[PDB]
Paper text:
ATPase family, AAA domain-containing protein 2 ([name]), also known as [name] (AAA+ nuclear coregulator cancer-associated), has a bromodomain and two AAA ATPase domains. The [name] bromodomain (BRD) contains the canonical, left-handed bundle structure of four α-helices (αZ, αA, αB, αC), which support the two highly variable loops, ZA (residues 1003–1030) and BC (residues 1063–1068), which are responsible for forming peptide docking sites. The bromodomain of the [name] protein is classified as a family IV bromodomain based on conserved residues and the structural features it shares with other members of family IV. [name] was shown to recognize a di-acetylated histone H4K5acK12ac modification that is associated with newly synthesized histones.
To better understand how this longer BRD recognizes di-acetylated ligands, we grew crystals of the [name] BRD (residues 966–1112, C1101A) in complex with the histone H4K5acK8ac (1–10) peptide. While there was missing electron density beyond ligand residue 7, we observed excellent density for residues Ser1-Lys5. Five polar contacts between the ligand and residues in the [name] bromodomain are present in our structure. It forms hydrogen bonds using its backbone carbonyl oxygen to the backbone amide of Gly2, and through its side chain hydroxyl group to the backbone amide of Gly4. As seen in other BRD structures, the conserved asparagine (N1064) coordinates the acetylation modification on residue K5ac. The carbonyl oxygen of the acetyl group is coordinated through hydrogen bonding with the side chain amide of N1064. It is also coordinated through an ordered water molecule at the base of the binding pocket that also interacts with Y1021.
Residue numbers in the entry:
A (entry chain B): 1 to 7
B (entry chain A): 978 to 1110
Write the structure that this text describes.
């Protein structure tokens, strides 16, 4: 995974 | 003559435009209607080699890049699989985007299952086969 959105 | 082959692909593109429009106006799939923006998600390109989204699918339909619904679904699957590969499962936003990716996949397959004539699809796949020769 990457770090994810909204960050 | 071989006009019949081009007629098949023209009808296929019209069908694909219709399916894609229904996906793109579904509020659940807004997040997949534009490419992921590296300015908002700077690590995206370090995870995802082949980005895809519904606006790119529409461009590809119009430039004749899909000769079969199989190849179209390959790109719907890629939207979903990119989203499940990139997005972790740590907060409610992550879970929402992951559930939306699966629903995009499931919705597209269900429309296709319901509305696509199998002999029509098979003809398109076999023309593509004969053009590979």
């Amino acid at each position: 995974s990457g770090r994810g959105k909204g960050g | 003559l071989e006009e019949q082959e081009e007629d098949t692909f023209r009808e296929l593109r019209i069908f694909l435009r219709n399916v894609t429009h229904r996906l793109a106006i579904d509020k659940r799939f807004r997040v997949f209607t534009k490419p992921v923006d590296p300015d908002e998600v700077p690590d995206y390109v370090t995870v995802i080699k082949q980005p895809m989204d519904l606006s790119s699918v529409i461009s590809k339909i119009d430039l004749h890049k899909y000769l079969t619904v199989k190849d179209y679904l390959r790109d719907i699957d890629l939207i979903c699989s990119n989203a499940l590969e990139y997005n972790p499962d740590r907060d409610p936003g992550d879970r929402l985007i992951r559930h939306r990716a699966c629903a995009l996949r499931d919705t597209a397959y269900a429309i296709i299952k319901e509305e696509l004539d199998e002999d029509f699809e098979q003809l398109a796949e076999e023309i593509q086969e004969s053009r590979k020769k």
